[PDB]
Amino acid sequence: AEAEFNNYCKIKCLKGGVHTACKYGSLKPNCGNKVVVSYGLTKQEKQDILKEHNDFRQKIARGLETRGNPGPQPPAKNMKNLVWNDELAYVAQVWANQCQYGHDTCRDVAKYQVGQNVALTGSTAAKYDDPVKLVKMWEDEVKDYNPKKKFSGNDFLKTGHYTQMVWANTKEVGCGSIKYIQEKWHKHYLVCNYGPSGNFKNEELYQTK
Ligand code: NA
Known part of the structure; x- marks a missing residue:
């Protein structure tokens, strides 16, 4: 949580936009009328997420x-x-x-540009998928990835999460999580930021062997 003391208002993202940590200087859920059940990840969950990313890579x-x-x-x-x-x-x-499914406009840090994968599932039952399960959703996009073609030649909408997971140049990952209830849907929202960012148009996922 030490990062909250960094002044992100001085960060400038390539495509502009006010940095997320400058927009919201609080670490407290800010979800309109949604009922926040819990937020954050346990030490074990973080480790499980990391291991899944690495086992996959x-x-x-x-x-x-x-x-x-x-x-x-x-x-x-x-x-x-x-x-x-x-x-x-x-x-x-x-x-x-923020409980706003999608990508935030500017999330880069002082060290490099940052990539991101988001996952969300909603259920009528009071149950929430395991973080690792949401991560596997990104992995499964690999079924639609054609390696005979370079990164830019593939369908981003179908494989954009997969490609960020296996981006060789990406070396660090950090995620956030929140479970909330919206209009009787019990949802689990997982956000994972990657550094440095992956998914650069004119680059390859990794050096093939
Ligand atoms: Na196939």
């Missing part, structure tokens, strides 16, 4: 992901595990606390 890197359009995904020569980043997690959490 390694699966891909070792040439073990058979899914694709067509599969399999090629092995990687430069795939390193991600490490959890508290600042990314903080900014992700501030965004999550």
